[model samples]
Target chain A: PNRLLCFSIYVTKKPDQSEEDHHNHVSKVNAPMMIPFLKKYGIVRYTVKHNDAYSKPKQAALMAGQPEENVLAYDTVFEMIVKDIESIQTMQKDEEFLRTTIPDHFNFADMTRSKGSLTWIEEFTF
Target chain B: RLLCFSIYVTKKPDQSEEDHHNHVSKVNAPMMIPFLKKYGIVRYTVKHNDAYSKPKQAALMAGQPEENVLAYDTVFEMIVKDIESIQTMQKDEEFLRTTIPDHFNFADMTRSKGSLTWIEEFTF
Candidate 1:
């Protein structure tokens, strides 16, 4: 199957940010709702950044007990089969639904860009 | 959308050559055989002139003509070029609504002509 590579990035908060807030953001909003929506749209492959040797460059170095770049403030990656770009546009445009699902304090812009971001990486044709 | 490239070959049975069995060999055995084996293809032509000169010409152009006329283009690269050109024409907004996932194996038993519908085969 030909597949699209979308990086559904998840980020850790800055040092000033509270751990509990970030944890709640991921466990409560992203885990329950967003993941399901992604699955339904045929996004099945993923990578979680942690202390692993084979992880992305920043994470990998951090795991190896080295300080490099920034300490992976962002980490998760996802791959998918693209059905249409409209689906993604719809998700972004649904501000009411997004605010309802995510924490009231969560910054939509931060999650989408500036810091943690979700991006379409590339295409895999087989 | 991702792209998969395939070729639907038709033979004219040149009087100088033998038959369809030798078409691959006579046309450009080295290139075509490896491509077919690599992709595990059955066929990609049926309705209309899907086998028309445009595609065949592209395929040949992608290959090395010094080897054979059919060797003008590598089958895989030719299709990749086609897909890239289509994507270029589509641009950004058009792509959001209109890109198609049209790649499939002939062995899969379902074929699609365009965006809306596909044909399926069944046996009872």
Candidate 2:
């Protein structure tokens, strides 16, 4: 059998966000969707970002702990995650890594009644 | 699609060079011809090298070269490179570099003068 390395990345907001609307976007979005999509794509390795440990810890620290943060906070975090996704995608394109198809975005929040504002980026590798 | 790395093994003396291409041809057969015939793989080649598996010591050295290492690049699946073991030869270097519509592998068609398909078997 061949040795394979499958890396899957799950990015969630730092979990201290606006709750005036009562939806935990990070928990409701990143956790559920990224995990399954990573599985569906046959990902064998998994990683998650929580306490500002990605490359730019300074920026992550500043962004995640902003005292007056808001929706813009989630946006900034999501953009950073997407940027990370782009870096990996480029590596695959250049054959530095091997990968498969990217799936469409979906939701996993409570289905009884609301459209969720939480979203995520999922990626797989082998 | 699926980017797969298939490996085929060929044994040499206790210390002989690794013939990766020869082994790959045994399993994947060109691994790129169909893509090329339809103009998918345009230009590609394999790079042979030696990268050690791992190491031990106080500090990691620059890495020692093992006797076996190979990397193949092909046209379709559009411009992809993968570390493959073996299977068969789907295409050859010359056909990829030159526009030779007449170029073909021998498995499917009758053996011709400039065909790119050839296979050999060895005992472990």
Candidate 3:
């Protein structure tokens, strides 16, 4: 099946659970936050895919085309984590609040001037 | 690591049949993640190492530098939220203040409304 979207959190700190269990925990945390945001923007049709962490770090040693104690991989994951938080925060702050609940009428003109001022405004053609 | 994949809009016409073996090459575009705390080991270390992308990617992929794409910045928001949640759970210094109440009893002590109360103070 086509995965509309996939969210991978390069987890730095595990939630005191086994890898599989932690994966489920993260999915639980992420689902509610995402569902409303997706529904609000009418992206309910989209799917949310999840992934796990590195299976075995020692086996992924440098000789096997890997790098030892490399900072590049960590930073990249960290940055992605940042991006996800930004999306959720934007959805919570803007989509769940500013977006009108009323049927049709909305202030689309004023919204244009406020691009970047509000993260998700332009996406909705607000 | 933390990658939020979205779809691509246009399709390629010039690529060979074998190249078209892939349904579509998602842009996998990067979005610059803004500063989370303006601080952290990650922040300080990145600066200490001069934010070198090469080594950074390796650390992210579990010591696999070759697998590091380091191309996108779209996950900053998610990272920030996770970081905040972690700090709160661990009772981090800055977060500890957030757990307390700012009642009228301590209203006089309330100098500035932090990010949490951002909505209370302003409509934004």
DockQ of 1: 0.02
The reply for model 3, stretches above 4 Å from the true place, is A1-11, A42-63, A71-90, A94-126, B1-124
TM-score of each candidate's B chain against the true B chain: 0.21, 0.23, 0.17
Ranked by DockQ, top first? 3, 1, 2
TM-score of 1: 0.32
lDDT value, residue B77 of candidate 2: 16
Candidate 2 per-residue lDDT, tens place, A1-126, comes to 332221221122223433322124334554354454444334433322222222223333222433322211211111111212333334334421232222212221221221111112122111
Ranked by TM-score, the better of candidates 2 and 3 is 3
| Candidate of highest lDDT | 1
Chain B of candidate 2 achieves a TM-score of 0.23
For model 1, the docking class works out as: incorrect
Model 2 docking grade: incorrect
Each model's number of backbone clashes? 9, 20, 37
Q: Score every model by TM-score.
A: 0.32, 0.19, 0.25
Best by TM-score, which number?
Answer: 1
Listed in order, the DockQ scores are: 0.02, 0.01, 0.02
Off by over 4 Å in 1: A10-15, A39-67, A75-83, A102-126, B1-124
- Residues A17-69 of candidate 3 have per-residue lDDT tens digits of 35555444334554444446555533323322232343233223211432333
Native-vs-model 2 lDDT? 0.25
